[PDB]
Amino acid sequence: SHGLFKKLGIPGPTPLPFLGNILSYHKGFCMFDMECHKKYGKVWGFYDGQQPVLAITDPDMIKTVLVKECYSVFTNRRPFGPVGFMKSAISIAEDEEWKRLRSLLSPTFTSGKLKEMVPIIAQYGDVLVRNLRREAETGKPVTLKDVFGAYSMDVITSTSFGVNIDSLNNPQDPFVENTKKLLRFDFLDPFFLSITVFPFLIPILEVLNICVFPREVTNFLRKSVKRMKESRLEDVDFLQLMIDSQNSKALSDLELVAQSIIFIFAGYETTSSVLSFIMYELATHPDVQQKLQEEIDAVLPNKAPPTYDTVLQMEYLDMVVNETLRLFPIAMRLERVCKKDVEINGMFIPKGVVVMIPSYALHRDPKYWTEPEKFLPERFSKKNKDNIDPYIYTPFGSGPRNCIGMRFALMNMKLALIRVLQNFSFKPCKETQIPLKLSLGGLLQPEKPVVLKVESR
Amino acid sequence: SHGLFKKLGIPGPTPLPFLGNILSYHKGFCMFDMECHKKYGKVWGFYDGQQPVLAITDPDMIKTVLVKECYSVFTNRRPFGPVGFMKSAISIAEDEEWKRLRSLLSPTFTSGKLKEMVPIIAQYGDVLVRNLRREAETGKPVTLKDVFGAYSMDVITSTSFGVNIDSLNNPQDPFVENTKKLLRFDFLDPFFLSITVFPFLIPILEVLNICVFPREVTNFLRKSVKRMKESRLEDVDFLQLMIDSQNSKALSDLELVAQSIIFIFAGYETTSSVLSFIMYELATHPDVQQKLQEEIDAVLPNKAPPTYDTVLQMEYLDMVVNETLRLFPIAMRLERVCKKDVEINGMFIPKGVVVMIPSYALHRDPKYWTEPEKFLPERFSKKNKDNIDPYIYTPFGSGPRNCIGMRFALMNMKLALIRVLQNFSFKPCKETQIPLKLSLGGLLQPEKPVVLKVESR
Numbered sequence: 001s002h003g004l005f006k007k008l009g010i011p012g013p014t015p016l017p018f019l020g021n022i023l024s025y026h027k028g029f030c031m032f033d034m035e036c037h038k039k040y041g042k043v044w045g046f047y048d049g050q051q052p053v054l055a056i057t058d059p060d061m062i063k064t065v066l067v068k069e070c071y072s073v074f075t076n077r078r079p080f081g082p083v084g085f086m087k088s089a090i091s092i093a094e095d096e097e098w099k100r101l102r103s104l105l106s107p108t109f110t111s112g113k114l115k116e117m118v119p120i121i122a123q124y125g126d127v128l129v130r131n132l133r134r135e136a137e138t139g140k141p142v143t144l145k146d147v148f149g150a151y152s153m154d155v156i157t158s159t160s161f162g163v164n165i166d167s168l169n170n171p172q173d174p175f176v177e178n179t180k181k182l183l184r185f186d187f188l189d190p191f192f193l194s195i196t197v198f199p200f201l202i203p204i205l206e207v208l209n210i211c212v213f214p215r216e217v218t219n220f221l222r223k224s225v226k227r228m229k230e231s232r233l234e235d236v237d238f239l240q241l242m243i244d245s246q247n248s249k250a251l252s253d254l255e256l257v258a259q260s261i262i263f264i265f266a267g268y269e270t271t272s273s274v275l276s277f278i279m280y281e282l283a284t285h286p287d288v289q290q291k292l293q294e295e296i297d298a299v300l301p302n303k304a305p306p307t308y309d310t311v312l313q314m315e316y317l318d319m320v321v322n323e324t325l326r327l328f329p330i331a332m333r334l335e336r337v338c339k340k341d342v343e344i345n346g347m348f349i350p351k352g353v354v355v356m357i358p359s360y361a362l363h364r365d366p367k368y369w370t371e372p373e374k375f376l377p378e379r380f381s382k383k384n385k386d387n388i389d390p391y392i393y394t395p396f397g398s399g400p401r402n403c404i405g406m407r408f409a410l411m412n413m414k415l416a417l418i419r420v421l422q423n424f425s426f427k428p429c430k431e432t433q434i435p436l437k438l439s440l441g442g443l444l445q446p447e448k449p450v451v452l453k454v455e456s457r
Numbered sequence: 458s459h460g461l462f463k464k465l466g467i468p469g470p471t472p473l474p475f476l477g478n479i480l481s482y483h484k485g486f487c488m489f490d491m492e493c494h495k496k497y498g499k500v501w502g503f504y505d506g507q508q509p510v511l512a513i514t515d516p517d518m519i520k521t522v523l524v525k526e527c528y529s530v531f532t533n534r535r536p537f538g539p540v541g542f543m544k545s546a547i548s549i550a551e552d553e554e555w556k557r558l559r560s561l562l563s564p565t566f567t568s569g570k571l572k573e574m575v576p577i578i579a580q581y582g583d584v585l586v587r588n589l590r591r592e593a594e595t596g597k598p599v600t601l602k603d604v605f606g607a608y609s610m611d612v613i614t615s616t617s618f619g620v621n622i623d624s625l626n627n628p629q630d631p632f633v634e635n636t637k638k639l640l641r642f643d644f645l646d647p648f649f650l651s652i653t654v655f656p657f658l659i660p661i662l663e664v665l666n667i668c669v670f671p672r673e674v675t676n677f678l679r680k681s682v683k684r685m686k687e688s689r690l691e692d693v694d695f696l697q698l699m700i701d702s703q704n705s706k707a708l709s710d711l712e713l714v715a716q717s718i719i720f721i722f723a724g725y726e727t728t729s730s731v732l733s734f735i736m737y738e739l740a741t742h743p744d745v746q747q748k749l750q751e752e753i754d755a756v757l758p759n760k761a762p763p764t765y766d767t768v769l770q771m772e773y774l775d776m777v778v779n780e781t782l783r784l785f786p787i788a789m790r791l792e793r794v795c796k797k798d799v800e801i802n803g804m805f806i807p808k809g810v811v812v813m814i815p816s817y818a819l820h821r822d823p824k825y826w827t828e829p830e831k832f833l834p835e836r837f838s839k840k841n842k843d844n845i846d847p848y849i850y851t852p853f854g855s856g857p858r859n860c861i862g863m864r865f866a867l868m869n870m871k872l873a874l875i876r877v878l879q880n881f882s883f884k885p886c887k888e889t890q891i892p893l894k895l896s897l898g899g900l901l902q903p904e905k906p907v908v909l910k911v912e913s914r
């Protein structure tokens with residue numbers, strides 16, 4: 001397998017027996033992709049164990065992969081380990097099963113449904129603010145991941161199940177204790193590297209019902225969901241939307257639970273992390289934070305509560321969120337498996353190769369962005385935004401298999417930022433890491449938790 | 458596991474995850490051991506996958522391992538893969554099972570038994586000579602491994618089973634076709650490297666009856682042996698010695714067959730290879746070849762047939778054989794597993810570590826041998842031989858688990874050399890590789906087969 005890119009005349013780091021190139025992950029995924037881009041140019045290939053991965057950076061080729069040939073050739077992501085029934089989660093499902101699930105779930109994420117969820121989201125912005133004020137009146141530095149983590153979970157439990165908890169102050173509530181375990185996978189941890197080198201072990205793990213999603217958590221949520229369903233049946237959240245959908249091919253009961261679980265997984269740590277990065281940037285660029293506070297006060301005088309429509313009115317807020325996601329595209333990479341031999345944009349790609357789009361590297365490419373390391377919201381101004389290629393800037397992916405939750409996530413984050421910035425200004429501590437450094441693990445996160453001073457307005 | 462030698466303050470090449478140091482075998486075992494000895498000194502540690510291996514070179518420590526603490530601590534070699542019933546072969550057996558087998562088999566290899574086998578061995582020296590003469594009368598270069606391979610097999614089939622074949626001229630005889638498959642393992646081949654990196658797969662292979670000894674061969678020999686046994690029962694070879702032994706704890710029928718098979722394995726390619734190296738050295742040092750021919754003619758005038766006692770009379774023959782085995786110790790390394798935490802000669806060795814004695818590296822160590830790359834039989838002269846440390850010079854190992862076949866092998870080789878040198882002189886071709894280069898694989902063998910001109914005396 002390790003002779004593939006050599007045979008195709010594609011450059012890339014020379015692989016080692018068994019390992020491929022995984023030893024080059026010692027400084028994390030993003031540094032690897034940046035260094036490869038710099039060394040090899042527009043396309044390169046490497047090996048995750050024995051799995052060939054072809055990295056592409058030409059926006060035309062990216063469009064072909066993510067959009068034009070999504071259904072025919074590049075439909076699925078790569079398998080990553082033993083998943084049991086979570087096989088049915090839309091992010092893991094393949095081919096026609098995926099296409100069916102995306103159809104069934106698409107109406108659930110429309111703006112019309114989002115707009116109806118906003119009062120629920122807004123409520124926990126109030127909770128977030130009350131909790132923040134408690135920490136602002138006692139001038140103690142605040143750990144963002146903790147406070148935005150609780151916010152993220154509060155929005156999840158209410159908008160997905162109508163479970164209303166102040167999780168920051170109720171950490172040992174059984175529901176919170178279980179859902180909080182649905183964190184992102186670290187694909188550079190020993191287990192996932194071992195599976196990468198020994199992928200032939202995954203069926204053995206599956207037959208023994210060993211799953212990368214914690215069984216006690218999925219068991220808890222399966223029986224919780226069944227309780228909720230039959231209390232509702234009979235006598236605004238994602239559960240009810242899905243319950244209504246299978247009220248017709250329609251969603252299996254097991255499929256329903258898989259989606260409830262994956263939505264938590266998809267939105268919990270992702271939202272929290274992006275909010276922490278945004279607040280870090282605002283704290284370290286006071287002028288941006290002030291300008292944003294000025295916009296919010298203009299659109300919503302007298303600390304008026306945010307609404308769906310007023311959120312969409314805030315252009316500078318949009319610019320700040322988009323520029324943070326340029327710097328910190330937490331997915332790092334996008335991937336699709338090539339399901340058949342194809343030739344796209346003049347290049348032959350063999351069946352079975354994983355095609356990868358290195359979002360982080362492209363987001364920080366000097367050839368596409370002036371001073372790419374700098375936080376500059378004007379990049380996304382109404383004037384400049386037309387000049388941004390949607391296949392270079394891909395924090396939510398692109399095409400039919402992009403982030404189905406993108407509108408919700410953006411609304412969720414913006415509602416939080418508005419409420420928080422109406423009430424507080426955030427400033428650096430001396431224990432604030434400046435400049436922020438990224439972890440060298442398999443997740444895009446700060447090396448040390450972001451800690452900030454919170455001051456009442 | 459990879460932090461062990463670091464923790465003990467023992468030097469050695471820094472291992473890679475999963476692989477340990479096996480990528481350093483790319484130029485073979487012997488080059489690796491030479492380079493480590495040079496770089497790290499008297500002791501060093503490395504990792505075969507996750508298995509720690511401690512290399513030692515102090516003759517006092519070597520004596521402790523191979524002799525003093527053989528029974529208590531360093532009894533067994535390391536496991537190497539799926540072996541099925543060949544588990545019972547004496548070279549593979551462990552602990553009390555080994556100790557029992559060595560006891561049962563020891564009387565079989567006494568000089569008294571050897572002396573009785575010599576007329577049988579001698580017969581195939583005559584066959585070897587007749588076959589060589591056929592190739593000498595038609596001045597075609599001879600490939601040593603082919604001619605000494607056939608000799609080695611002829612001696613094996615007759616001295617182990619009383620099966621009398623001219624294998625050179627009967628290659629498609631079913632017995633020869635099967636026994637010829639019992640070649641030495643190449644532990645650097647893809648299968649054995651894979652097992653080294655994935656040793657957790659060996660039990661899976663065992664439960665499926667996948668064995669590194671070819672099943673069709675062992676099946677053939679098992680049923681051949683059973684035929685022979687019951688033709689002999691009722692109505693001088695190793696089989697009869699073993700048959701007599703179980704005529705008493707006594708050797709199982711399955712144990713008996715395991716030994717018959719392992720003796721072929723142990724003696725077939727080993728004898729052939731050493732004979733080829735010796736003839737290479739004689740051909741490239743005509744003065745040595747002549748002196749040896751002079752000794753043989755003195756001891757056995759008029760091409761007198763060699764006998765057990767006249768062979769032992771030939772001191773220069775002994776020197777030539779011993780010096781070739783110094784240059785080419787085909788086992789390369791000796792190994793023992795440490796079965797309990799011990800401290801020997803001031804050094805702590807943890808349970809489970811493989812202790813390795815790098816025979817090849819010590820045989821070519823400039824600090825023990827003047828001009829170690831040169832073929833100099835006088836090293837082993839009656840005068841100089843006292844100065845040779847038996848823990849530095851170890852072509853047949855040392856101690857209670859040394860080569861049980863050593864006397865036989867030496868007699869076998871000497872009888873062949875005598876008969877051959879009485880009749881022929883061996884000279885280089887232009888297709889003779891000079892200087893000889895060694896293979897970079899996992900076996901100590903010439904890079905290209907040794908080919909020589911054979912001239913009738």
Ligand code: HEM
Nearest residue numbers: 091263266267270331395396397398401402403404405409
């Ligand atoms: C700031 C927060 C988030 C970011 C940055 C983000 C980013 C992404 C990215 C990059 C992908 C891969 C798209 C591709 O491969 O082209 C993805 C997929 C997905 N995301 Fe999000 N996401 C976020 C929040 C959410 C939320 C709140 C949900 C709620 C349901 C969600 C649900 C999903 C699902 C289900 C997929 C797989 C879609 C499919 O395979 O059909 N994500 N997300």
Ligand code: HEM
Nearest residue numbers: 548720723724727788852853854855858859860861862866
């Ligand atoms: C020139 C030819 C040969 C050489 C260089 C050679 C070398 C060796 C070496 C280095 C060992 C390991 C000793 C140790 O670990 O200390 C060994 C073991 C052994 N050899 Fe030989 N050998 C040769 C021929 C033979 C022959 C003809 C036989 C016939 C039976 C034989 C049978 C064995 C057996 C059974 C063992 C394992 C002993 C035990 O574990 O108790 N070898 N040999």
